[PDB]
Design a protein around this motif. Structure first.
Motif, mmCIF file in Angstrom:
data_model
loop_
_atom_site.group_PDB
_atom_site.id
_atom_site.type_symbol
_atom_site.label_atom_id
_atom_site.label_comp_id
_atom_site.label_asym_id
_atom_site.label_seq_id
_atom_site.Cartn_x
_atom_site.Cartn_y
_atom_site.Cartn_z
ATOM 1 N N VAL A 1 2.149 -3.963 -7.155
ATOM 2 C CA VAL A 1 3.149 -3.321 -7.989
ATOM 3 C C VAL A 1 4.377 -2.891 -7.179
ATOM 4 O O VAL A 1 4.278 -2.549 -5.997
ATOM 5 C CB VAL A 1 2.527 -2.072 -8.687
ATOM 6 N N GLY B 1 10.305 -5.854 2.800
ATOM 7 C CA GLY B 1 9.939 -4.649 2.076
ATOM 8 C C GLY B 1 10.493 -3.509 2.903
ATOM 9 O O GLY B 1 9.776 -2.577 3.284
ATOM 10 N N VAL C 1 3.073 -9.439 -0.938
ATOM 11 C CA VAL C 1 2.700 -8.046 -0.712
ATOM 12 C C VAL C 1 3.480 -7.595 0.534
ATOM 13 O O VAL C 1 3.489 -8.292 1.543
ATOM 14 C CB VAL C 1 1.183 -7.887 -0.468
ATOM 15 N N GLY C 2 4.178 -6.468 0.443
ATOM 16 C CA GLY C 2 4.947 -5.988 1.575
ATOM 17 C C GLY C 2 6.386 -6.463 1.546
ATOM 18 O O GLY C 2 7.157 -6.143 2.453
ATOM 19 N N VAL D 1 9.619 -1.927 -2.953
ATOM 20 C CA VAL D 1 8.708 -2.646 -2.065
ATOM 21 C C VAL D 1 7.419 -2.939 -2.853
ATOM 22 O O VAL D 1 6.924 -2.081 -3.596
ATOM 23 C CB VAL D 1 8.374 -1.784 -0.792
ATOM 24 N N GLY E 1 3.648 -3.187 -3.245
ATOM 25 C CA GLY E 1 2.466 -2.641 -2.617
ATOM 26 C C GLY E 1 1.195 -3.077 -3.311
ATOM 27 O O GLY E 1 1.175 -3.462 -4.481
ATOM 28 N N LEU E 2 0.116 -3.041 -2.550
ATOM 29 C CA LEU E 2 -1.203 -3.413 -3.034
ATOM 30 C C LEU E 2 -1.759 -2.238 -3.860
ATOM 31 O O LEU E 2 -1.550 -1.067 -3.530
ATOM 32 C CB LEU E 2 -2.091 -3.739 -1.807
ATOM 33 N N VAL F 1 7.710 -1.154 8.086
ATOM 34 C CA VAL F 1 8.371 0.133 7.959
ATOM 35 C C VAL F 1 8.081 0.792 6.605
ATOM 36 O O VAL F 1 7.892 0.116 5.590
ATOM 37 C CB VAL F 1 9.912 -0.050 8.125
ATOM 38 N N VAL G 1 9.541 4.097 4.233
ATOM 39 C CA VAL G 1 10.571 5.117 4.046
ATOM 40 C C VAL G 1 9.914 6.216 3.211
ATOM 41 O O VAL G 1 9.514 5.992 2.060
ATOM 42 C CB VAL G 1 11.804 4.528 3.319
ATOM 43 N N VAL H 1 11.264 8.169 8.123
ATOM 44 C CA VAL H 1 11.034 6.744 8.294
ATOM 45 C C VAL H 1 9.941 6.554 9.326
ATOM 46 O O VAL H 1 9.925 7.243 10.353
ATOM 47 C CB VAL H 1 12.316 6.026 8.780
ATOM 48 N N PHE I 1 -3.423 2.550 -1.129
ATOM 49 C CA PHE I 1 -2.551 1.766 -1.991
ATOM 50 C C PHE I 1 -1.067 1.988 -1.799
ATOM 51 O O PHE I 1 -0.634 3.113 -1.565
ATOM 52 C CB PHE I 1 -2.906 2.035 -3.460
ATOM 53 N N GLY I 2 -0.299 0.908 -1.954
ATOM 54 C CA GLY I 2 1.150 0.959 -1.857
ATOM 55 C C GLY I 2 1.638 1.030 -3.288
ATOM 56 O O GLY I 2 2.463 0.223 -3.730
ATOM 57 N N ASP I 3 1.081 1.983 -4.024
ATOM 58 C CA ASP I 3 1.389 2.183 -5.438
ATOM 59 C C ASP I 3 2.191 3.486 -5.592
ATOM 60 O O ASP I 3 1.660 4.589 -5.386
ATOM 61 C CB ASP I 3 0.061 2.252 -6.218
ATOM 62 N N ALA I 4 3.458 3.358 -5.977
ATOM 63 C CA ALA I 4 4.326 4.521 -6.140
ATOM 64 C C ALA I 4 4.589 4.888 -7.603
ATOM 65 O O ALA I 4 5.575 5.558 -7.907
ATOM 66 C CB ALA I 4 5.648 4.275 -5.411
ATOM 67 N N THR I 5 3.718 4.459 -8.514
ATOM 68 C CA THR I 5 3.916 4.747 -9.934
ATOM 69 C C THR I 5 3.710 6.194 -10.319
ATOM 70 O O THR I 5 4.234 6.633 -11.332
ATOM 71 C CB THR I 5 3.052 3.869 -10.848
ATOM 72 N N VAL J 1 0.053 -3.495 5.767
ATOM 73 C CA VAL J 1 1.256 -3.925 5.061
ATOM 74 C C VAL J 1 0.910 -3.872 3.563
ATOM 75 O O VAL J 1 -0.131 -4.373 3.152
ATOM 76 C CB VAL J 1 1.675 -5.359 5.452
ATOM 77 N N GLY J 2 1.747 -3.217 2.766
ATOM 78 C CA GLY J 2 1.479 -3.116 1.344
ATOM 79 C C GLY J 2 0.713 -1.859 0.983
ATOM 80 O O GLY J 2 0.402 -1.645 -0.190
ATOM 81 N N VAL K 1 5.757 3.215 0.690
ATOM 82 C CA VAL K 1 4.983 1.978 0.777
ATOM 83 C C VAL K 1 5.398 1.257 2.072
ATOM 84 O O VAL K 1 6.587 1.205 2.413
ATOM 85 C CB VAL K 1 5.264 1.056 -0.466
ATOM 86 N N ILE K 2 4.422 0.714 2.792
ATOM 87 C CA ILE K 2 4.671 -0.015 4.037
ATOM 88 C C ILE K 2 5.088 -1.469 3.738
ATOM 89 O O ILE K 2 4.307 -2.258 3.193
ATOM 90 C CB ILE K 2 3.410 -0.024 4.929
ATOM 91 N N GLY K 3 6.312 -1.812 4.117
ATOM 92 C CA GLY K 3 6.815 -3.147 3.883
ATOM 93 C C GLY K 3 7.061 -3.901 5.170
ATOM 94 O O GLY K 3 7.238 -3.334 6.249
ATOM 95 N N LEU K 4 7.038 -5.217 5.047
ATOM 96 C CA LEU K 4 7.261 -6.117 6.165
ATOM 97 C C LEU K 4 8.777 -6.179 6.437
ATOM 98 O O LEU K 4 9.594 -6.157 5.511
ATOM 99 C CB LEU K 4 6.676 -7.502 5.791
#
Ligand SMILES: [Cu+2]
Ligand SMILES: [Cu+2]
Ligand SMILES: [Zn+2]
Ligand SMILES: [Zn+2]
Lengths: 153, 153
Positions: free
Chosen positions: A4, A51, A113-114, A148, A150-151, B4, B6, B16, B50-54, B113-114, B148-151
């Motif tokens: 997401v 990301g 992802v990422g 970004v 994310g999983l 990275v 944020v 960061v 999880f890289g879920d920011a909802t 990542v993610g 969320v950690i992105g590439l």
């Protein structure tokens, strides 16, 4: 597998993009809900390479294109992996929908992802414009919001 | 490989966090700069599943723990993969530093990542508290900011 991206920006545009893929070879289902767009329009929608949110939506980089192809429509054989074409907005500026895609994946070496999802302020010409720029960005213009990927579960 | 996160939130905390790992078996270098924290303190810092920011920082889920171990200090053999201990804040509420870690990876099945990085409002007891909760979250408390950690590159 589920992923997401929460789209945010300072331009009044925001939303959520969900991804679901069963296995690597299968299509990924992309669903989205985006508010605050120009009404009754078509807006460029793509997965960008990074990301990285350190510099607004600028740091997301270019369209994700591991295969080094030109920018195209989602149904074109020649397109960037990240090309999701245009999303239609209603009379209230809302874009909502879902589609299946076989290039976008949440599993494997091309996983998104990422990476990032970017919703544009302009219409994507699908690489059919008279320019070198058409073959790069589809002339979709500014990036009012991004997030970004994310999983999740 | 570089990644990275944020960190953002509505509590005055932001920052960061950068990650760098050469190859899967090598340590990942984690560097961070976080502002707006309580001054002269120690604050829990971890990678969540999880890289879920909802849903603010809530949707990041629990500490990333694929090996199903109890919560511990970064130097403990028994710890969650995501356990980064406490970050020290200065007289201005700034936490800045870097360290190497061999459980956190940007490559492979345990890649972060993610996923998400969360900076807490309280001190992490490093799993040494008198509670079942100590062995889960280290009693680090609220999550004022996360990302969320992105590439990236
Ligand atoms: Cu784009
Ligand atoms: Cu935490
Ligand atoms: Zn493209
Ligand atoms: Zn933990």
């Amino acid at each position: 597998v589920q992923a997401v991206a929460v789209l945010k920006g300072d331009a009044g545009v925001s939303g959520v993009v969900k991804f679901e893929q069963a296995s690597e070879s299968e299509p990924t289902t992309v669903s989205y809900e985006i508010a605050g767009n120009s009404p009754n329009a078509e807006r460029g929608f793509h997965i960008h390479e990074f990301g990285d949110a350190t510099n607004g939506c600028v740091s997301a980089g270019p369209h994700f294109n591991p295969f080094k192809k030109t920018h195209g429509a989602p149904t074109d054989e020649v397109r960037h992996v990240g090309d999701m074409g245009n999303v239609k907005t209603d009379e209230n500026g809302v874009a909502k929908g879902s589609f299946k895609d076989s290039l976008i994946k949440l599993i494997g070496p091309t996983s998104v992802v990422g990476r990032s999802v970017v919703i544009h302020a302009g219409q994507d010409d699908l690489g059919k414009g008279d320019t070198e720029e058409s073959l790069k960005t589809g002339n979709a213009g500014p990036r009012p919001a991004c997030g970004v990927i994310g999983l999740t579960n």
